[PDB]
Amino acid sequence: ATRFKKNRKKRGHVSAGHGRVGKHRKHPGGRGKAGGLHHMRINFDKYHPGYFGKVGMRHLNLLKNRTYCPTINVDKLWGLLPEEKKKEFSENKDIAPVIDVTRKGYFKVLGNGKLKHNQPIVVKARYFSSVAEKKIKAVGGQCILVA
Amino acid sequence: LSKLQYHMANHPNDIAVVVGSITDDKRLFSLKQLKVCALRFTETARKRIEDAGGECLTFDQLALKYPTGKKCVLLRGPTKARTAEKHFGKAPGKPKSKARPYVRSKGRKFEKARGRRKSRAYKK
Amino acid sequence: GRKSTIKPATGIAVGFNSGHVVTKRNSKRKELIKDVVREITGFSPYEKRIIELIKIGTSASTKRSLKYAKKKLGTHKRGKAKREEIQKVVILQRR
Amino acid sequence: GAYKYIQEIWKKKQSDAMHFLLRVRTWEYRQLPVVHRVSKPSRPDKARRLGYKAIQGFVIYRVRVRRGDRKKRVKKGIVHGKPKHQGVHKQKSTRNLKSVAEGKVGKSICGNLRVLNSYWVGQDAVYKYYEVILVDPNHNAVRNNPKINWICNPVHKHRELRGLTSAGKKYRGLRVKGHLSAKSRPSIRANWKRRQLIKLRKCR
Amino acid sequence: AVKLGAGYETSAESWGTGRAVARIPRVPGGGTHRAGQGAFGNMCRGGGMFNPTKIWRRWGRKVNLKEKRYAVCSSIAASGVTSLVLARGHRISHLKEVPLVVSNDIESLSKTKEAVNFLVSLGLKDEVNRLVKSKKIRAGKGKMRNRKYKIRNGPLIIYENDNGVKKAFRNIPGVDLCKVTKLNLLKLAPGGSIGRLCIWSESAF
Amino acid sequence: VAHNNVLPNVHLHKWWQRHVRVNFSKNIKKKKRRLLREKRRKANGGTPIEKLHPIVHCPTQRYNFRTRLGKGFTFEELKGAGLTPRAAQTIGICYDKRRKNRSEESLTKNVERLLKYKNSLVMIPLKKNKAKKGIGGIPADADKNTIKEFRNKKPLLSIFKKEKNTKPFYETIEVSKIDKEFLAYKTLRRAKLAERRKNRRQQKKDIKFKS
RNA sequence: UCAGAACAAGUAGAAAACGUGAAAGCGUGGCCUAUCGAUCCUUUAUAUUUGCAAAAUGACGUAAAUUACUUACUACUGUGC
RNA sequence: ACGGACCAAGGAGUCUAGCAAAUGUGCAAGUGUAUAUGAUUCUUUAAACAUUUUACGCAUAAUUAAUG
RNA sequence: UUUUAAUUUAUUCAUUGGAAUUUUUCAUGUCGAGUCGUGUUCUUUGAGAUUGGAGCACUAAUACGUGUGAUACAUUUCACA
RNA sequence: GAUGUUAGGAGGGCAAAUCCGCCGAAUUUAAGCAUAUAAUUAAGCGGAAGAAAAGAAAAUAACUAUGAUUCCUUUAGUAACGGCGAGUGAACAAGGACCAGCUCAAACGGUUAAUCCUUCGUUUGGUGCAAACCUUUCGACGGAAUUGUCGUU
Ligand SMILES: [Mg+2]
Ligand SMILES: [Mg+2]
Ligand SMILES: [Mg+2]
Ligand SMILES: [Mg+2]
Ligand SMILES: [Mg+2]
Ligand SMILES: [Mg+2]
Ligand SMILES: [Mg+2]
Ligand SMILES: [Mg+2]
Ligand SMILES: [Mg+2]
Ligand SMILES: [Mg+2]
Ligand SMILES: [Mg+2]
Ligand SMILES: [Mg+2]
Ligand SMILES: [Mg+2]
Ligand SMILES: [Mg+2]
Ligand SMILES: [Mg+2]
Ligand SMILES: [Mg+2]
Ligand SMILES: [Mg+2]
Ligand SMILES: [Mg+2]
Ligand SMILES: [Mg+2]
Ligand SMILES: [Mg+2]
Ligand SMILES: [Mg+2]
Ligand SMILES: [Mg+2]
Ligand SMILES: [Mg+2]
């Protein structure tokens, strides 16, 4: 709200906070991104390193759909079950959960983190990372490709 | 919660106090019998604690119980793990800085050319 | 990218007929008219030229004809088609 | 069958017989006034394929249009602005010559009528000749007939002047559907406006 | 919002330097008093105001649903607590219980008079009197903009179903009515002050 | 530009003030719409404003799994139902000339839906009393009492909304039924590798077929 | 030099592979202090690295199999960009 | 050096967009109910309430010119 | 007052005409040309060996066709129109 | 083909916020400027309606696939364009509002144009105090039309 704007605090100070010698002029450094690469090079260098120049291949019609793959790490996979069910599973080493990871909105299973030892888990997903697959297997589980 | 558990690992039974919020961790499987004072428990975390047969103490309760903090443990969450903090320090541009530039987005088109690879003048 | 209509799709996201399980479910008058038109109109100058080229007989000549067709009609497909038609016409004439 | 035959004949165009006809016809047209009524379509089949019908209120007008680009209208050749905009002489119009043809008949000469469509007829190097099919929306023969009747509505005044005839549709780029034409559809201008639009939200 | 080109409808331009007059844009021409006058610019009579107000100012604010809910809950709690209610300004000294709950017979009251009587019986006679007193004509220019009277805010009757309450308490000054389902924080905490005096039906409760 | 901030990207170099629409009309507009729909409903005494739509699977690899209401039922599905397109249109059901069926299962589902709809619906006679059987698809016209009874009951709008997900995502499996030897990553990568050549052969196969 | 950015020019190394010397060593140009150049574009090198967006192009390659839309398995797969 | 004869009133860091930091607040591996719907919602009500008996954003993972 | 829902009563007799599905025969038809397209020019586009448009030159194919499948091309699939 | 003060009709001008066509700048930004930008904007010229335009796929996808247009939320400040500088910048999908499909041409019907219109009429009705309206089917006399009307899909 206007009442707690700085300008209201500078009300009777002559220069309105923008300094007496170096005035407040309109667009002194140029307009917008302006002299990046000339008089504002240094700022660009120090805060915006890779800004100028282009790189890599064009990709003329992207379609972000084609390439959509939300990921989850195996660590989080057991979290995807409710507490009580999880407890039950822990109790019965004799029976394992299948987890349709796609149903919960993730396509790739990546392999960050530990899985509970021995507790076997069946994972249904579209993509697995080598390591994630290895983790699952080591635990006595299966990775089942779905589509 | 996981972090709390880790911190409690060596000395059990004594009461972890945390001046902030404690969040739950889906990445934990098992929860030990924890006695924790905090400013806030996210609901799920609280529920988990309850299930563990633990105790969620507020600060007043803690004070009542342990006014000199006997058998307590102050803990902090990860402070400089904040995403804002990743833009601080030496500016990206200064060499050997691991500061994220403020950029619209990620992808080759955005801040990945001159001064980011030996091929386009220089690096960093 | 590619699939096959025979066989169900391998239950995989990527690769050949990758995808889900699901079981798949699948003149004379004109000729006469054309003839009439031919009788009426004959051919157009470019067509005539092409025919002549074809008659010349060799591979080089054929190539030349094709080139001409491309130049006139635009596009290699159309030109090819035209050439084929002309060849057919020539054959017919020869009979 | 007859109409099929004449379609096929007219496809040939550069073939001797057709060529001769075209030569005669264009010559004849060169002589007549720029826009003038004709009693019967010169290409009945083609007219039919568009909108033409032998109902009382339907009329054909033969119209001649100069070929070529239109010099950028400026006092003397000189243009006063930046070099990008400086050229005259290779300035091609957004409208088709067909559109122009229909425009000139529709507008001041036959303001009473409604332009339905137009077809090609002939050309020389100086002129292109079109026949434009028009209709009298007040003739009851047209008012009553439920197919066609539509043109009697007031929303169809001067279709030719709003680029709503086939030629108009062409140069607005509504003939091409798809990804090739995404940027023009409700109208190019309209689309542009939409894209510019800043929607705020009272709540925000 | 000010109309778009307010103060800028003129053709005015500045005469520039060599006339011994400030270089504010001037109205051109002659004959009028307006000729030669300072034209647009915040300083000038007939000028445009500075940053003219625009319809695209942010008028509303999104508030987090959860936050709103929390606020509502807190207001309810406040309404509960006697001291808070008292602070908020109500003459509640003669009411026994401040989570004040009343039988469903209230929801069927047909007549404002009856409602008033009921209120009096409850102990809110004083409150009612205060409400009656405190219709006064506003200070300032509100008077000119259909905000003529200023009225203090009385109890809030919360009801489960309208079989008469809406209509009967309508017309008692400062008395407001809300369905339990659709509680409005604007009514529960007028001027953002906690602890309005709420009268609940038992069903509502 | 100064200091360490995002490089500014504000597309306001055109006369943007000319086309700012502020939506002061939102809630009121919504209310108006609601009113209009109510009016429409009233006009169609008893009958539902809403039209039957088939459930369909969304395209593209990312919405693949989800299901939502398409426009219109496909000739084949109508046929299955035992229904003419025109007739269907006349009732509350949408028809889609351009939609096609690849999946038997999908087709079955939509015909099931159609059947359900048919079962649900009771037809008011065209000219009063005179109860006659329909045309092609449409059911028979019920008598008066039945109609009255139906009216007295609530008009169900459960069918016009899409069927929500079946759920699963957690399912028990016996440990002895797991196949511990099935390299899934290997399968993937191998498949990826082999794609081009399988493509090379499919084309050949196609060519062969074409003669 | 300095923002302790760049380029440039150096100093110190490491991994290769060599030269010289009997060797220890010395050699990443000139005994040392100058002799020089971003983005974009072009250009020609490099590569069991990729792409051209529904696919394919070395190659029906190698095995089987039967005439057919057959089943496996291959680091090497058109021009142009 | 310039401006100021006097007096009264008017008279100049504002508003939006998007980003950031700071701080408050909520909830927290989530968060924001976006359009839109619904209500026994209808002076105020253009707010408030509600969210159907896996929407999208940002975040939760990075990195590569790229197949990945 | 405006209209538009529900509710109330239709029942006899005439016959021209049409419609939908359903069998079973036979028909494999027709499907928009100075138009599409290519070249070239200018414009316009985010459209990139040209997105649309236009001028000019050249000027097609018949559904097994021709047009899209965002890199110019050829040889050919496939999908969609 | 001209010609008619022939009989009957139509257009013209005003108004414009939204709308549709053309036509078309420059200030401005780039700290200069020339391509770019401003902007397919302002002005100019023409044309409609209560909305206009668009619209029933020579569409998108590469899926388990969707299915006219429009609009909103988004995709996305993304793909892309650009003295690759300044800056510009969509589309598909997804979620909604709303949802409506169609008829010419061509094919077919010659044991017959079945069509269509002008003028003149004729006689049942309905509301109105009148004024007017509303419909009802029936012929004539004209023409139009085989260079193609109507039905069938
Ligand atoms: Mg000071
Ligand atoms: Mg000053
Ligand atoms: Mg100075
Ligand atoms: Mg121009
Ligand atoms: Mg004023
Ligand atoms: Mg005052
Ligand atoms: Mg002096
Ligand atoms: Mg001075
Ligand atoms: Mg003085
Ligand atoms: Mg003065
Ligand atoms: Mg903050
Ligand atoms: Mg066609
Ligand atoms: Mg441009
Ligand atoms: Mg595509
Ligand atoms: Mg006019
Ligand atoms: Mg400048
Ligand atoms: Mg300047
Ligand atoms: Mg200058
Ligand atoms: Mg204008
Ligand atoms: Mg329209
Ligand atoms: Mg949009
Ligand atoms: Mg984004
Ligand atoms: Mg632009």
Numbering used by the authors:
A (entry chain O): 2 to 148
B (entry chain S): 64 to 187
C (entry chain b): 2 to 27, 38 to 106
D (entry chain P): 2 to 205
E (entry chain F): 53 to 257
F (entry chain L): 2 to 212
What does the paper say about this structure?
Much of malaria pathology is the result of exponential growth of the parasite within erythrocytes, and given the critical role that protein synthesis plays in this, the translational machinery is an attractive drug target. However, because anti-malarial treatment at the blood-stage requires rapid intervention, we focused on the dominant, blood stage-specific cytoplasmic ribosome from the most virulent form of Plasmodium, P. falciparum (Pf80S), as inhibition of cytosolic translation would be expected to be direct and fast-acting. In this present study, we solved the structure of Pf80S–emetine complex at 3.2 Å resolution and built a fully-refined all-atom model. The ribosome model comprises the large (Pf60S) and small subunit (Pf40S) with a total of 74 proteins as well as the 5S, 5.8S, 18S, and 28S rRNAs and a tRNA bound at the E-site.
Using soft masking, the resolution for the large subunit improved to 3.1 Å, with the small subunit at 3.3 Å. The structure of Pf60S superimposes with the yeast 60S with a RMSD of 1.6 Å2. The largest morphological differences in this subunit result from a cluster of rRNA helices (ES7AL, ES15L, and ES7CL) protruding at the solvent side. Compared to human ribosomes, P. falciparum typically has shorter ESs, some of which are entirely absent in the large subunit (ES7D-HL, ES9AL, ES10L, ES20L, ES30L). Firstly, eL41, the smallest ribosomal protein, bridges the two subunits and has a 14-residue Pf-specific N-terminal extension that reaches into a pocket formed by 18S rRNA of the small subunit and tightly anchors the protein. Directly above the P stalk, the Pf-specific ES7B1L forms a diverted part of ES7CL that is stabilized by several electrostatic interactions with a C-terminal helix extension of uL4. Towards the back of the P-stalk, the C-terminal helix extension of eL14 caps the stem loop of ES7BL. On the opposite side of the ribosome, near the E-site tRNA, the Pf-specific stem loop ES34L is positioned directly above the L1 stalk. This ES appears to have caused a 60° rotation of the C-terminal helix of eL13 relative to its position in human ribosomes. The tip of the helix is displaced by ∼28 Å away from the L1 stalk and now stabilizes the interaction between ES34L and the loop of h22.
